[PDB]
């Protein structure tokens with residue numbers, strides 16, 4: 001039952017992610033605006049929670065929390081938990097940033113992004129104003145997001161999309177390729193069915209989404225090269241140890 | 251409470267491992283195990299007596315047994331306090347580098363100078379037969395015997411072995427470990443318990459605890475050497491398959 005499968009994935013998503021596209025979108029039409037050093041200082045003063053590195057550290061804190069939620073979410077995808085633990089780890093290593101950057105779009109518009117559970121809005125112009133390595137780490141994610149948003153997915157669509165992202169059978173070093181592939185196919189048949197039901201007039205949505213998954217893999221490939229490089233060129237700036245593990249040999 | 255902690259680890263071990271040293275030792279001296287000592291008796295054993303080229307076939311039975319023990323060790327680990335709260339990548343590193351040390355320590359439980367119990371005590375495979383297989387294979391098996399017979403002279407029981415194996419898995423110095431200080435903290439808790447347990451359980455055995463600490467370094471070297479031999483069978487013996495989980499375990503090991 002593809003409808004039942006769809007609904008359980010969706011409820012797994014609602015359970016594990018507090019900020020949904022529904023909540024984000026309703027807010028995006030009250031949050032404290034962060035657009036310079038001063039407003040950031042204020043935001044950190046209780047209102048919401050060098051400049052470029054500090055923003056980078058805030059970014060790391062948010063993505064590592066999203067990795068945690070994705071790890072708990074994956075446990076609810078049928079058959080994920082029955083994979084050997086080393087296969088679960090490989091799947092998370094390689095999929096968690098593709099999922100993060102897909103879900104980023106839910107909290108973005110052309111002008112900036114919601115932070116701290118909707119309490120703040122950080123403007124894209126401020127992020128463009130940061131020093132060179134950091135500024136162009138962030139901008140490509142905005143570019144992907146505004147385009148992604150034009151597909152007009154909802155949270156029920158996104159739940160299946162992220163599930164399908166995590167269960168990629170072609171991740172480097174996967175042990176049981178055929179089992180992962182089989183579970184992914186189940187999610188995708190569900191996703192195709194759900195898009196028919198949810199988006200009846202949206203011709204071509206499902207191949208569009210499959211192409212978005214390849215786009216995300218290249219977004220993340222390019223992201224990793226940039227993070228890998230900051231690790232060398234930017235001697236003073238720290239990387240969270242879990243992120244260090246994720247980018248290690250990626 | 252070092253005594254409560256010990257009991258909980260003991261029970262996690264009873265739960266996850268069917269063959270205990272207790273059960274093994276009473277078998278090694280209900281009906282006797284079928285003796286496997288040549289091609290013919292192995293064939294009979296697999297004809298439902300015990301299970302339901304000779305050197306490679308034995309090697310494949312070895313793989314099947316150790317991968318089953320890996321599975322039991324992974325479940326066992328979940329019950330060691332604080333193991334499950336480690337990030338999943340750290341749990342995987344701990345099992346990767348610890349499962350075979352734990353395996354070869356528990357091997358001693360089912361071994362005597364003459365051979366080893368197989369299939370839940372249904373079978374006894376002689377050491378002479380295993381010495382008789384082709385060079386690479388005979389050479390992987392024999393050092394485990396040498397380790398086990400020495401290990402058995404310490405006269406540990408299942409309650410001792412449970413904390414020992416826990417301590418093995420929570421080794422803070424495994425290559426590529428993320429949260430080193432936290433793994434070290436959990437191990438120290440296990441070792442304190444173990445030290446307490448040996449003094450209660452083996453009051454006369456002074457120096458047992460340092461002896462055990464040295465056995466863990468002995469096992470690390472046993473396994474380093476095992477991995478080197480397994481990695482080489484992969485290259486030279488191209489016709490003989492390696493279970494995909496063991497291939498993952500030995501991948502980039504040393």
Ligand SMILES: CCCCCC/C=C\CCCCCCCCCC(=O)O
Pocket residue numbers: 055058059060062063064104113115122137138141227243
């Ligand atoms: C103050 C900034 C608000 C944080 C917004 C969300 C944070 C990160 C979203 C992804 C941005 C891409 C580059 C930054 C991510 C670096 C850390 C990582 O690689 O996980």
Ligand SMILES: CCCCCC/C=C\CCCCCCCCCC(=O)O
Pocket residue numbers: 308311312313315316317357366368375390391394480496
């Ligand atoms: C037919 C013979 C059955 C023997 C089964 C006993 C199980 C283990 C004792 C031998 C362990 C050492 C052999 C090398 C292990 C190969 C697979 C592995 O490395 O996990």
Ligand SMILES: CCCCCCCO[C@@H]1O[C@H](CO)[C@@H](O)[C@H](O)[C@H]1O
Pocket residue numbers: 084085086087089090173320324342345346495498499500501502
């Ligand atoms: C689940 C039982 C424990 C299995 C232990 C096997 C661990 O293998 C390791 O898995 C990692 C991905 O998870 C890879 O990054 C390493 O290259 C690989 O060697």
Ligand SMILES: CCCCCCCO[C@@H]1O[C@H](CO)[C@@H](O)[C@H](O)[C@H]1O
Pocket residue numbers: 071089092093242245246247248249337338339340342343426
């Ligand atoms: C906690 C879920 C997310 C974890 C992502 C971290 C995965 O890192 C990988 O973990 C393996 C050990 O498990 C190592 O072999 C690899 O070298 C490392 O790159």
